[PDB]
Amino acid sequence: VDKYTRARNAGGKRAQDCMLLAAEGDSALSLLRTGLTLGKSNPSGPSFDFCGMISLGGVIMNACKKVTNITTDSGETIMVRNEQLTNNKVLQGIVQVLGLDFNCHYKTQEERAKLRYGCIVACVDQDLDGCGKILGLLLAYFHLFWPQLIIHGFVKRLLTPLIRVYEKGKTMPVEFYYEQEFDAWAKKQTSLVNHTVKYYKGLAAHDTHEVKSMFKHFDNMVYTFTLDDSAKELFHIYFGGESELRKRELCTGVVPLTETQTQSIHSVRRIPCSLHLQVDTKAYKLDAIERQIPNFLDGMTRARRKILAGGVKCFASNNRERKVFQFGGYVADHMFYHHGDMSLNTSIIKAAQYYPGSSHLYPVFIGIGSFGSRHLGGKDAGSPRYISVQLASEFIKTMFPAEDSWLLPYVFEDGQRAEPEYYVPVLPLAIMEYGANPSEGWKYTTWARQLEDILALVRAYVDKDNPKHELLHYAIKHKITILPLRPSNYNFKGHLKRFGQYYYSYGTYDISEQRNIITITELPLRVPTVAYIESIKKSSNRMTFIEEIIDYSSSETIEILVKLKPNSLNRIVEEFKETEEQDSIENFLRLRNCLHSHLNFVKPKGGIIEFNSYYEILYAWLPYRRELYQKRLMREHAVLKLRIIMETAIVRYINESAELNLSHYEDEKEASRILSEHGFPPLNHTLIISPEFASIEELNQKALQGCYTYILSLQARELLIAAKTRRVEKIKKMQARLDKVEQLLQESPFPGASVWLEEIDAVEKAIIKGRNTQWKFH
Amino acid sequence: VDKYTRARNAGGKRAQDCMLLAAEGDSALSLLRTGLTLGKSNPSGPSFDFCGMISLGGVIMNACKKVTNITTDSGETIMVRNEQLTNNKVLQGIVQVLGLDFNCHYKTQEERAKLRYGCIVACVDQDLDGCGKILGLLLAYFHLFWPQLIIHGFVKRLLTPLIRVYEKGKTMPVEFYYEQEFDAWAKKQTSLVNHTVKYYKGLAAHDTHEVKSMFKHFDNMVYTFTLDDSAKELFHIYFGGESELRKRELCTGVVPLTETQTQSIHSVRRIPCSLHLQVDTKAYKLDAIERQIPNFLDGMTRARRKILAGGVKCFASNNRERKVFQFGGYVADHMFYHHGDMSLNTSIIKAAQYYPGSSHLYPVFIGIGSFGSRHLGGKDAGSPRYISVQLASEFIKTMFPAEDSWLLPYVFEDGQRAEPEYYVPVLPLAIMEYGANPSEGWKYTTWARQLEDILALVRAYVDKDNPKHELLHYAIKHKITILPLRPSNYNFKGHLKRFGQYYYSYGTYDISEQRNIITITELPLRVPTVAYIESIKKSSNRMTFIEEIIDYSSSETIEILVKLKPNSLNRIVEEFKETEEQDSIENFLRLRNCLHSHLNFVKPKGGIIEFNSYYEILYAWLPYRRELYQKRLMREHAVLKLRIIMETAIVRYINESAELNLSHYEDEKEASRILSEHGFPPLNHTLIISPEFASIEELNQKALQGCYTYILSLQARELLIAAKTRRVEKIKKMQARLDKVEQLLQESPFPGASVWLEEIDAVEKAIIKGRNTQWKFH
DNA sequence: GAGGTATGTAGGC
């Protein structure tokens, strides 16, 4: 087996005293290599002897769904391992390394004495992923196959400190493990002074002195897993065929460990499996839900919104083209993406992809290069080393307003600003965008709607001139949903049909019996048209019904001809029995594609919310835009009144400076006192000019006090009469804007109605422009 | 064979009409994939048929040195292919793809008709590497094995445009190929207006419309190689056992192609092999010489100096730690490194490595993580994903002064600033640093000298108080070299000895015949101590002379014990015959390590210069520092006189502003006219405050004219009397500094003598501090 | 005696 170092005196007379170290990644492998090669000054410290090495290679499969538990009626319960589980390299490799056998149950001392290694230790990163997932699946598999090993403490793991705080003059850290504990320690402390906080989001982040200190006390910080009676049901709920069973368990939320339990764990290293599954595995599942379910407001996931934030920050200064990996590094460093690089590049490529049938109907990035056509479904995209991506500045600026991004709540990472909780847009992307995301307890499926029914719905909800406005409000208060919603017909030459409670997509075809050609210019919108012909190449008896398949379908279009026997038309017609909803030729070509919508979405707080129809999503997204417009108009009015009073103060100072003669003053304090005695209000102009996402109450309590830096910072060029006239004109313009804002807040329906109408018009104009081109605005 | 797409109708009746495309990298493979899958609207455009696909995988082996040409005395000349050439995957794979055989010579039509492909086309990037090297080796191998194929035009290649200039309103570019041609076109044009210049430093940089335009005229831009009578000697000189033969050919320089030759090439696509070898291969060889041979002044290579420039730029704002790949991306994007990423990361790791026997005696980066110990010679360094590097700010600032970097000449990349031509330091790194770099025609070997002989030499050359100053100057004018130079003893417990004209390094050992232990605490300075014991494990008859080898050598130290037979001492002593220069035990342990110095260095212009001894390097490096100090002092004096006159003007304006009353003025022009009529000189303060590497003549001709932006840009806070007093004190301080500079220019030996002495003292203090620690300054 | 074999490096592809 590869990546397995055979330790000396292992699998022999001293095998029971040996230990085995399991690594989730090569970083842990390197850390273990350094620890083993340390050697000197470590008598109790484990050298390469009795240690060995095995790497889990990242994420391994769980045998809960692989087993079948068939033919248990013979009086004994036997589990048959599926061939998909048997041939996995990692699982059989670790089985061979341990020398264990599936059939035997190690209840007595000798049975576990035959094991090659006395114990197995799992060494993973302290981030939310890995511990809880990799440990979770590993020990769940161990419990499912050999519960006695967990019962007798054969399996164990080492627990590294996630966060360390070092005090100057002292050589020992706090070595805290959970972020809740670190927050409690920070808040219980009088102040965060004389302390250095170190974050270890990965084992390889530790230094040489850190790893040597860990290996000096390697006998400590190693915890043995203990099995309880209640662990079996937790394992079945968290892992297994039962899907809805874990839904009701995830919908509640993580329960923090009690103080007495933590004290017991720290005193003696016996970690129960139930507590680990309830804390670490549940937290990992919740994190996966958050990171894979797009927020209904954004219609896009956390990684996608972080990518959008990085693109907005990078391309704001210059819209010049940037390569994929440069942008990935930029968004990783600036926006604190501590997961990886390949996943980030893949997500960027998927977001920038644009072709008929693609997941992104309105990509946020204008891509240059070979992103792949509809034929491979984006699988034939080029390498990230050379693919070029640039931001769609017009579409983003008409779809995600700058002020809206200013007032959005932000996620704080290590006390620093990061991507907002949700980019609530002028139009809900959860409706336009569509994709299939299976997320650790829920499935996310969507189908695009036409940008005519939703536009009419929003216009009626906003514009009071629409006769359906009152009717739409009645529908809002009574869930009537008078206006219809239909699947988007863009980039689809077929016809959509509705039967019962499900929509269906049909391609178009032409039949020429004189030459026996089966032309299919249109095919279902989501099939890649290449895996489709592969499926039709394995379509059972249709091999005798056809001769061969020829593909002339190029990019941007589909055209496929099917060779078939001259006597095949009648037999396929009499065999397929065309129904009232689908054609016999459609059945032969599998042109029918039933579409299902699983509207599983996360609330801005972080909880799963389900929607029966898109109308619920729209009616839940609307009030957020209402509140954001109201608060944005209020903040604009407040900052404009501060700006106008500040500009009036500056103008009065410029007028009075002819006889003020402030040059004959000693320091800044004397000038400030003189100008205060002259009646000038002190304003923090560094906050007035650039509010920088300041709420109303905090902006007011910051503008109550201030300083005369605005007066003392103006140059010797702004005192000219031309500058004074320009400032007076700006005063008049901003006063007119303030009056316009004030009268906008007084409209009957709701604040910011005409603003929303203008934003809708601008964004639909930009969308139409992008439709006319191939999303390349040049 | 992998990465080989089998084209339809290939190797059959229509095989002679097929073509084969050879790609140097996967980027070219992807471009060819896009071109082949384009298909439609291209009747003459080649589809997947008759094309195939093969990859060269970048650099391949050259058969010129692999062949032996043995047993040619039988009346026929036969070349025996070495097994190292036969088992190469790429070579045998392409041989199998073509279906050719080594024994047969294809002179007639049928012999080349048996070939699977009618012709072979090499598709590589248009940068200096690839075309000239990959093409060079490929067609040299083809000529060496089958000259008739080149004679009959079997081998060919496609030539892509390196630089394209697009004119607005026109759809055709200039599609220029060589940078000389592009420069000639730019200089012959009246102006660079209404033109967009696009650089393609790689095939994948081309866009979809670019590649479709190329494939529309794929019949063009394909050039067939023609063999001449003189090509054989060029092939032998450029490739083969003859080493010195290519030295005299590289020492001359590249000869540009004549206009008539270029016109003939463009008119009919028959590229001679001699012209290609003389231009592209020679330019690639010169580029390799420049990029591999370290500049004698710098003591480091072009990539290393670009890395240092990137580190200086990145860490100047903040000395915070940065990961390896973030820094690599930063230096690639900012400093225009268009080669790759893995090589850059490897170079960064090698530069940041610090251990006994390492190449870098004074690393410019303070590294955090596992860079590897002396045992593996840096081969056990960790992954770049997690290795931490930070700049040694104190060492760099005391070794590479900021003003010196200001006045250094810079390399211009695409009209933008890049790394300087040479970082001439306060002490020549070519002496302290040492490494083994084989560079495409020359070998670079160095051995470190003690930082006591060179320090004394520089002090005597600089300080006039040293009694050897006049003697050292006499040596300079007469090559006497009175002062000695000895190998550095740092991190080496052994003793250096000199015999004849070569130094020798010996380790130390202890013998205890009572217990038969062979202890070796010290070993030669450059052997990795792990490959050494591997060599001694294959050391012929010494297997019978020993029993086994045990290694307790940890990091930072070496201790090895050798098990040997009790009756082995006398027999090894009587077998090895200890000489007067090395011991019998030293011979048994191979403790003697003869050191050779190949002082092959590139001039700042770019030419190879050889040095017989380190004294020549020192005496050539000294005048550069002399000139830089002289010009730096002159520039400082000039910029200081401009600064003092500007500050005096500002102070006079502040004094006069009490009664000036400039507020009653209309625009900036009126104020400028008034202040000019008041006698204020107009100075470009944006150049006076920050000169930004301005030469004396250009600084003077820029300071002759100017504007009153300095007067009009000062804020309303600098007019206080405290600011006036502070400015007066600054005036006095800079006047004193100007007087000090003026008296420094008048010292008898040379300008900047005491400055050099102080810089030497500071840099040696910093070096001593780094010696006391493990190059970790905390 | 003569010939053939194997890394060893940096900066590359």
Next chain:
DNA sequence: GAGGTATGTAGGC
């Protein structure tokens, strides 16, 4: 009739 097999996506590894 019943059971077993194979992707098919987006982020993670």
Next chain:
DNA sequence: GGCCGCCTACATACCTC
């Protein structure tokens, strides 16, 4: 995130005939 081939320059055992 790490398994495949060398390029150019070149002191050096080698070991069983």
Next chain:
DNA sequence: GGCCGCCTACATACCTC
């Protein structure tokens, strides 16, 4: 720069007895 394993959720032929 691209070959290896899946994780979670789940409409769906299937085909020869």
